[PDB]
Symmetry: D3
Subunit: 306 residues, 6 copies
């Protein structure tokens, strides 16, 4: 049984997202860190167990994988596909490595980030750094409960982890990241009932709208994908609010894990390109993607044996 990384972690209150590119000649330094990352996570985390719940998930990009490793590639590993929709665009931005650091405390995240980046000084260039925070009762920046319909247990494992379809990379996963900025002024201009029609759920109670009320262009409608056998195709999401009040930045940092990127990409396509029934996802009228990257997060045992 291959040990996965802490993809299927419990709910945490704080996150740091770290996206870097690998400078030329930096390959060796990166490789050294990769084999040490698990022990660094344990070194920082153990001090404050068991309420710390510190984890780090390391992701490697498509272009970077070719620079770092020879031999087999994960079947689904490719650069993020840019989506030029009629109205909305899903941009692809550079990213070689992803560090998805989560804890119940921000300091634990920052300490681990410090350690990781300290080792990576002069080998990487930082592309993006986001410090996320749980907002109230699991609500996002739009004021809706965010995470409700995430799969749990065996359903989560089946949706997230690579299996026998790519046996060399079993216990791995695929992560899609996008940084979204919200137009809060426009959003708070809508009535609650109008916002509900945008999301597809009720605001306070988080009850899903009935199928006869739920618009075809609501976020919930478009991100609902049925598979070839009638089964729901699921992803695991850990959206984190971030922001700066002075610069008027109110954002959602989207991260979605799946066993194949094709599930996540189908959702993206429906959202940005639209379908026959829906011009595009209404949430995009209040949200702008400013980054977009795809990573493969290998099994933990892959990282150690380098």
């Amino acid at each position: 049984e291959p040990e996965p990384q802490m993809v299927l972690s419990p709910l945490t209150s704080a996150a740091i997202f770290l996206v870097v590119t690998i400078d030329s000649g930096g390959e060796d330094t990166v490789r050294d860190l990769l084999s040490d990352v698990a022990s660094l996570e344990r070194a920082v985390g153990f001090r404050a167990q068991p309420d710390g719940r510190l984890s780090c998930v390391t992701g490697i990009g498509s272009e970077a994988w070719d620079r770092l490793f020879s031999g087999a590639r994960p079947a689904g590993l490719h650069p993020f596909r840019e989506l030029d929709g009629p109205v909305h665009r899903a941009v692809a931005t550079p990213g070689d490595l992803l560090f998805h650091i989560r804890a119940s405390r921000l300091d634990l995240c920052f300490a681990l980030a410090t350690e990781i980046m300290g080792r990576l000084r002069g080998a990487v260039t930082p592309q993006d750094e986001v410090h996320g925070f749980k907002y109230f009762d699991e609500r996002d920046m739009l004021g809706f409960v965010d995470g409700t319909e995430n799969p749990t247990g065996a359903a989560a494992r089946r949706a997230v982890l690579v299996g026998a379809e790519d046996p060399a990379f079993a216990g791995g996963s695929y992560a899609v990241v996008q940084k979204y900025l919200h137009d809060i002024d426009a959003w708070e201009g809508l009535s609650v009932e109008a916002q509900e029609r945008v999301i597809g759920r009720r605001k306070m109670t988080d009850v899903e709208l009935s199928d006869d009320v739920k618009p075809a262009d609501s976020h919930v409608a478009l991100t609902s994908v049925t598979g070839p056998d009638g089964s729901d195709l699921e992803i695991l999401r850990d959206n984190m609010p971030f922001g700066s009040v002075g610069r008027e930045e109110f954002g959602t940092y989207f991260i979605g894990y799946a066993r194949t990127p094709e599930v996540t990409e189908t959702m993206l396509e429906r959202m940005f390109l639209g379908t026959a029934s829906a011009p595009h996802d209404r949430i995009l009228d209040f949200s702008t993607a400013v980054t977009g990257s795809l990573f493969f997060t290998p099994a933990a045992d892959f990282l150690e044996d380098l």
Copy 2:
């Protein structure tokens, strides 16, 4: 009799520091907010009780006071005095309003900050915004325990709150803010023993160094001041670590409360200018001040009666 602001608050793990200048013609919008700031604190904070622990302390600058309030000034209110030492400099930077927001969770701080800043939009320009976090066991970015010798109870009340010396402003207090950036590379180049001689306390156990071992240019020695009376002059500090791993910013946000700014100014002079036996505070060899402002934090009832 006069009800003070929550200067003497319980220990909080998160904080937002918000410094703004008042734009020309923005005075009425500011005055309006100041009368509602307490009810915004309750509106955001109440639903998170009792462990939310949300509080906001509002401070007003010297120049800002004259623009806003026609009437008597607090006796100790003046612009931050710039200190130009032989080696180190304490800069004075713009700042009309200070919002010191604390809570057990960052989201509480962010929500209130949004509300305040939403009301002030178009009337203020942001000068500084810092998101602070408690780091492990009350440690600062230098890895030392921070806040040990803070006064408590009545001793704290007596050292912080304006009394009969300025009866029109009883229940008020004076806040000095400075944003410090650390040279962590140089700092981690010192042995622990050398670091302890810089601070004046043991690193791990936080036990004060013996009188005959403690250096004169150590932080503890230079920030220890006895008044003409013979008793210790004390301030209330709530230093918060902050920073960004990508941009390699590791900082301390200093805020000190005192019933008269004279106390805080004496400490600063001792630090930056030095004494007979000490050129300057050794902590300054590893810390650069980038901001510097002084604010009067009125009694709560002063703010409500506008």
Copy 3:
């Protein structure tokens, strides 16, 4: 000097409200319990200290007072004044003794109520029993945050505690209770915005509506009362949700404490009978009062010295 009961208690998540009438010839049994009530509280409470936060407030009705005691009475102690509005009616129902039992857990409330009723058995007839519970983020059954504008600290003390206006009963207070049942079906028929106009505050954020938007017949407008001297007249409220799903019973148990009943009664009159601007309180269109009683809660020392 006179020690009050735990009227100004921290916020608790559980409550038991117990209203009984004294049976003929039951006066002696009642007096014995009253002298012992404080010690029963300690006996039950201490086991679960310090997070138990168990307290009991004992109130005595007007008619009950004249049966139990001789000599001087509290100045404002009268039976509940029935209000006959054109539309809405505030009923008065029998109640001699009030037991207001609060704790962070229901078991502590139940164990104390059991000890009290065990000692009173054969002397009292139960009129009303309500088991109350905190509902989410301090929300009531209407979905609004309840308790935001309660006075705190010294302001709460001045609003609640009898002082020099009635020196023989200093440290006492007056409690008004009303059991309200809500018409949830009608309530949920309104949009959120329409509900906000009924209450006078924003639903999710609990921000008070601007004065130029807040309707004259909103709950907040009608319960805001100023005295001749311009100061706000305040009560301490500790409403608790209750109900049963099978009976479609969704209620608010109202309890308001004030130094004089005149304050509570004024608010109650503006709600039920209306003003020049407003016919009645809109909240009553969705709330029916089914009980109504007034009690005096004496100083703790009055109860002991008996």
Copy 4:
């Protein structure tokens, strides 16, 4: 691989038990809700994770099963059997649906119960609604620690979940419910030592009485049952205290889960009908059963795959 309901729940300090009968012509509305119950649980409970620990276990009665479904029946599903002993009797009362709602706080229980009943209005009639609360030291209303000898971990899973003996309903369980009211006057009239002889355990320390001093008519003795092979027969119990002080109601709401009702029913028999060495369970001298119903609690996927 079967996905069970949250029968094996962590320790929770609040519960709502809701027992309803299905009105004539209410089958379709009930069918729709059963399909949505897990999503209603998430809607209410997610916002209060992880400390909320909100779960709902849905049970279906024997008579109700035939009205709702057309396929196979669970092997051990039948109406609650009345036990008519010489002194004490275990009554059978009506119940088509059971909602066993648990959380760390009552508010989450009440919210979910509101959502469920909101959808079922005009299709069902409530028979029983009990709001349970944790009482101090995991004690019941008799003042004894309650739940000490519950199976845990793997032993619990084996005693509770249906397996290959009924493969189509694997992941399911059987729930027996009884509402007991206590005679607290008579009970507190006993000495502690005398109460300990009734239960079979020490009151304050909760240590089990030795085999030599433990009476044959004690609760622990009569509810201890060995199989033919000699292994202990176990049930999972999550009794909740409840009551009203003014009405003098001091109660234990009993709920027992087992992979087969035979186990639970054997215990009931020994309690009410007695043995050769014991007339009846001594606890019944201070406890009256006021309700009695049997339900099958299906695997969660059975409820989902109902459209």
Copy 5:
């Protein structure tokens, strides 16, 4: 106003009792420590806040006082008075210094003890060291809730703190320590009903026996002292269970704080010598005192100003 030591502390679950005598020529070392004890408390306690709840109360005996300090003595300071009763004896044992260390965790206590004894090494001889632990439900070694009738708030302050009757030592207190060893075998041979008659309270529910049911030789009866004033004479107690399973030692470490030792001494006389109504305290038939010492615990600033 003088600052007292943390004699009135929110009760904790762990304690170390440390009693030492001062060796020849050890006065100087002791004086050095006493002036540092408060800062040692913060050094060990601060970074563990707010959960640690670490405090140290330092007591000084009658003989020790005259070796350490010149000038006035506390009015009530004298050696522990031996009580040679007809059946039971209250022994006196040597002790110059008392350290009463409390926290929520034993490790916090041990760390402070280590620091104190580290500084006192070679100047003192240890007489007693006790590691104390409360049961989860505030029960003592006898299985009874212990601490129920301790005074709280202002009543506690008035009973424990030295006031105007001895103005120079205001804010001080008197501590009496006794280590008791229990005969558990004998105690557990009693039925609960019999044990209740020994104590004077119900075992399970901690309800006090009624006045006419409570035996006169019960613990609660004999330790209930009414002064010529008419009001109750109270002490603050913090009994801590201790023991060794292997050595069959099951003990209660008694410590009682009062503004004058006469209060404690009167109760102690009643327990050991009895009254006209009762031969002795019934608890003593199951409890043997093996140590006895009296200490003055001065105000914090008294120690600081050395």
Copy 6:
């Protein structure tokens, strides 16, 4: 089979109880062993939320022959005394081990009282240690202790006996050692020197890089690779203990392993050294005063007895 609570969540308090069985006290002991699990529940259940009470019961090699008939655990033998050039690992008598853990010491004590109450007059106590962990998981030497313990499935394969000895599957081997520290000598060292002794940074608990990590550091000598090339792991639960009056500052070491071979190898490397290292530098500040090996059977084994 059902294992004992060897794989426990982290607890801040512990009592270690080591006793020998007096002559003729075998039957009394057997009776306890069958009830010990139910005593654990009895004391623990009422505090079930946060109690985290558990008891691990171990039996020594000599005691096993006295108590049982027939099959012995393959790896069960008396603790090997190691007499090194400088440092000595002593063997001390021990028949039964009670490893009791909880979030609070009162719970440990309550259980310990029940067990010893029934064992009274049948056993002699050899050792009784009341353990407390520092709030930041630090040991008596001021270093974070437990960082590199295996978790999850890795911990199961390292600790629990499996198919290699099927009759005793679910069992484990515990080695206990009571260490007393020379604190004065320890606090004489600089932080940097202390780090060279341990093999990890003191504050941040980051392992020293392989270029700087000394060969005689604790982490170096206790890092063992088997023939497979895989790392040989044990589960440790070191507890600080002591007395400020007696100047006792100690670590009570306990190590669980699938086979005692792994623990004994680490122990050899520490006391006897390698080619690169004379001995473990931690021993220059730590003296072993007890040493005993026990087999901790599956819970079922004790029940059906």
